[PDB]
Design an enzyme around this catalytic site. Structure first.
Site, mmCIF file in Angstrom:
data_model
loop_
_atom_site.group_PDB
_atom_site.id
_atom_site.type_symbol
_atom_site.label_atom_id
_atom_site.label_comp_id
_atom_site.label_asym_id
_atom_site.label_seq_id
_atom_site.Cartn_x
_atom_site.Cartn_y
_atom_site.Cartn_z
ATOM 1 N N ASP A 17 -37.731 5.001 44.270
ATOM 2 C CA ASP A 17 -38.414 3.820 44.330
ATOM 3 C C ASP A 17 -39.253 3.213 44.936
ATOM 4 O O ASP A 17 -39.561 4.274 46.083
ATOM 5 C CB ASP A 17 -36.695 2.809 44.818
ATOM 6 C CG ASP A 17 -36.722 1.790 45.794
ATOM 7 O OD1 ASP A 17 -36.394 0.913 44.397
ATOM 8 O OD2 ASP A 17 -37.476 1.251 46.119
ATOM 9 N N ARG A 34 -24.925 7.118 40.335
ATOM 10 C CA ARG A 34 -25.037 7.001 42.192
ATOM 11 C C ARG A 34 -23.720 6.472 42.500
ATOM 12 O O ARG A 34 -24.433 6.375 44.131
ATOM 13 C CB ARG A 34 -25.603 5.339 41.644
ATOM 14 C CG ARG A 34 -27.615 5.200 40.618
ATOM 15 C CD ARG A 34 -28.246 5.502 42.476
ATOM 16 N NE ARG A 34 -28.123 4.300 43.010
ATOM 17 C CZ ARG A 34 -27.558 4.186 44.524
ATOM 18 N NH1 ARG A 34 -26.681 5.328 44.983
ATOM 19 N NH2 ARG A 34 -27.107 3.088 44.832
ATOM 20 N N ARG A 47 -37.816 1.063 33.951
ATOM 21 C CA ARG A 47 -36.018 1.295 34.109
ATOM 22 C C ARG A 47 -35.677 1.808 33.338
ATOM 23 O O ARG A 47 -34.061 1.433 33.521
ATOM 24 C CB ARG A 47 -35.628 -0.086 34.905
ATOM 25 C CG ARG A 47 -36.192 -0.788 36.486
ATOM 26 C CD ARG A 47 -35.454 -1.922 36.799
ATOM 27 N NE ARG A 47 -35.967 -2.544 38.370
ATOM 28 C CZ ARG A 47 -35.734 -1.285 39.331
ATOM 29 N NH1 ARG A 47 -34.795 -0.499 39.731
ATOM 30 N NH2 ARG A 47 -36.300 -1.677 40.480
ATOM 31 N N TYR A 100 -43.245 -6.288 50.659
ATOM 32 C CA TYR A 100 -41.558 -5.937 51.431
ATOM 33 C C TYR A 100 -41.895 -6.056 52.475
ATOM 34 O O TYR A 100 -40.650 -6.359 53.293
ATOM 35 C CB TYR A 100 -41.256 -4.555 50.276
ATOM 36 C CG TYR A 100 -40.957 -4.751 49.124
ATOM 37 C CD1 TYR A 100 -42.216 -4.597 48.290
ATOM 38 C CD2 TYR A 100 -39.894 -5.393 48.720
ATOM 39 C CE1 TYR A 100 -41.378 -4.991 46.724
ATOM 40 C CE2 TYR A 100 -39.212 -5.619 47.708
ATOM 41 C CZ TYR A 100 -40.470 -5.518 46.532
ATOM 42 O OH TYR A 100 -39.981 -5.752 45.253
ATOM 43 N N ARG A 134 -28.980 0.707 36.056
ATOM 44 C CA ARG A 134 -28.105 0.046 35.740
ATOM 45 C C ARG A 134 -26.949 -0.158 34.288
ATOM 46 O O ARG A 134 -25.634 -0.774 34.409
ATOM 47 C CB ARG A 134 -27.582 -0.994 36.591
ATOM 48 C CG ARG A 134 -27.970 -0.091 38.812
ATOM 49 C CD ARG A 134 -27.453 -1.051 39.693
ATOM 50 N NE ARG A 134 -26.326 -1.359 39.109
ATOM 51 C CZ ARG A 134 -24.755 -1.861 39.433
ATOM 52 N NH1 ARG A 134 -24.823 -0.371 39.960
ATOM 53 N NH2 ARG A 134 -24.202 -2.585 38.685
#
Lengths: 357, 357
Positions: free
Chosen positions: A77, A41, A28, A155, A32
């Site tokens: 992703d 973003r 990552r 998921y 963020r």
């Protein structure tokens, strides 16, 4: 067709060669915790960002402008794959990923695309990879990635994150045939996708088995391992047959302490470790052929820059200089301070050189 | 003052004695998978149920009416301790536990009670334990329990469950002095509480370190282990000094593979295991003095009754007959079938006898 790689330390370490220092990257690293990531973003919605090659390229490069990391990893992703298989997804800010219509019975498999057509649906990722490889201009290698079959299955069945994976595990016990069908569909989509990433310019590949820890050894060996093995074997095969060089492949099984012995025999150059496995114990499990990657507790970056350097020193002492790529034990968290990420990068570089001469 | 224990197999196994069969109990055996549990819980709200000794006694006995389990565990919740320390809690159905005002800075410690007064606030639990010990009338031993200091700290700081424990880990790295203060307050509340449980009639005690897995070894050894050790040492001391018999103490560190060696030296008769650690490997880690408890994947109970029996057979083969108490690797889930729990209980009894003669 691409610019010549200047700094190949990460690749040499991945193949098990001696290097002058220990290369480092962070999971990552485009994330963020960076204000500039939030800013670019803010322009598109999440999976729209993933579809703009220029936006992906920009987010990939951002951490490299801050820190001398030894690799870049394409921004994307893992959920692009089940999306390309025909599942509808959201990344509603503050909530995380969600499939509002998860797979819950065997009949739901009928809605997925033929996995042979998935790579064509993911052309945007290949466009981003080629662009980013050109723009990097050989500075460092570019890593491509995808989710591992079991993790993608969780998921798709759970519909998002879960603390137990009870619905996905209920499939393994109550619907083992349909589970193997889904895992095979995922494998068959992942192989051409990963091969396409390398064709587009990826110089290494990482498979994220982020949900390994829920399985334990018997179910992992039955339902996760065979597919992790098949991915590596088939990607290498297809690349050789296309006249391209295989790239080093990394398997990261988060909370997968119990699987390390099997993972070291699974056809991957590098086994990535979470922070719960002591480096010396991981080395005992995997043996002396594979490279280890990791494994600093990502929360250690909340500590002072001085403390980070001492934790890094300790970590490097435990791994030793050979067959090792430094990283965190999981991806950076959104509330982390970029200066402390910088401290981690600098500490790996400084201490690994001190460890050699 | 209490009825004489008839079936003491669980206690003999806990102390390391040879037994005629392997005793079994299940974490959350009083739980939502039982319709009768939902029914008696529908009467009060959650922490109100915890405060009615008759309701606690009833929920404790319910699984024993269904299954020949070798121990009962008092119905309560680990969060009664931070509630007694002065934190306001909720168990709003469908949402799980929540503290709407979590501890977030060092100053927040000022709101907690002196830990020496906590046992008096938890008089209701002792009332439930005495009642349940009387009503059981010696059928099987009664286990008391509490949360371990670190795990209680995570709920108090996070305000509920978390997939990362990032806020609680940020305390360990950024506020280590305040963290040790909180962990000591928790230890000092837990000791008189656990001692009171035994005074009231508990015949064994289990400490739930359910959030161990987030730490990894360095932080676990600094922040969780010392307090786990202090609890066992001080409870045993206080009981001897009151002229009572110590009871066997179980430490369950979920996802604590990395801590098993240290846990086997921590002053507990029994080390409880999650399902991710292979039984043979756990035995190597802990040595041949302590008893192991566990460790079937709770999701295995979704499988057929036939499959459950074969998984149990395998599990029992791996643990072997000595120094072993069968249980799941974590608590039963609310959607599980009581008949399959019955199948698990019967399989442990049948196969462990077959394993002996």
């Amino acid at each position: 067709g691409f610019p010549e790689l200047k700094n190949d330390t990460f690749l040499r370490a991945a193949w098990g060669e001696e290097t002058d220092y220990t290369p480092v990257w962070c999971m990552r690293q485009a994330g963020r915790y960076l204000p500039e990531f939030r800013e670019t973003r803010a322009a598109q919605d999440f999976f729209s960002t993933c579809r703009s090659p220029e936006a992906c390229c920009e987010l990939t490069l951002q951490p490299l402008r801050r820190f001398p990391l030894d690799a870049a990893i394409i921004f994307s992703d893992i959920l692009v794959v089940p999306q390309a298989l025909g599942m509808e997804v959201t990344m509603v800010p503050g909530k995380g990923p969600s499939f509002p219509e998860p797979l819950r019975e065997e009949q739901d498999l009928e809605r997925l695309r033929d996995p042979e057509v998935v790579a064509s649906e993911l052309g945007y990722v290949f466009q981003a990879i080629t662009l980013t490889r050109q723009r990097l201009a050989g500075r460092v290698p570019l890593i491509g990635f995808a989710g591992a079959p079991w993790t993608l299955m969780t998921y798709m069945v759970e519909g998002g994150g879960s603390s137990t994976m009870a619905q996905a595990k209920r499939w393994l016990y109550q619907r083992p045939q349909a589970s193997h069908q889904l895992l095979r569909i995922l494998t068959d989509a992942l192989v051409p996708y990963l091969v396409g990433q390398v064709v587009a310019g990826a110089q290494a590949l990482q498979l994220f088995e982020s949900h390994a820890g829920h399985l334990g050894p018997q179910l992992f060996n039955k339902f996760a391992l065979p597919y992790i093995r098949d991915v590596a074997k088939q990607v290498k095969a297809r690349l050789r047959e296309a006249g391209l060089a295989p790239v080093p492949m990394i398997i990261f099984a988060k909370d997968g302490h119990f699987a390390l012995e099997e993972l070291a025999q699974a056809g991957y150059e590098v086994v990535g470790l979470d922070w719960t496995v002591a480096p010396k114990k991981a080395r005992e499990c995997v043996g002396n052929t594979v490279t280890l990657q990791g494994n600093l507790d990502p929360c250690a970056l909340y500590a002072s820059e001085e403390e980070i350097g001492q934790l890094v020193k300790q970590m490097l002492d435990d791994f030793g200089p050979h067959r090792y790529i430094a990283n965190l034990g999981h991806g950076l968290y959104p509330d982390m301070d970029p200066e402390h990420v910088g401290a981690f990068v600098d500490a790996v570089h400084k201490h690994s050189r001190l460890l050699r001469q």
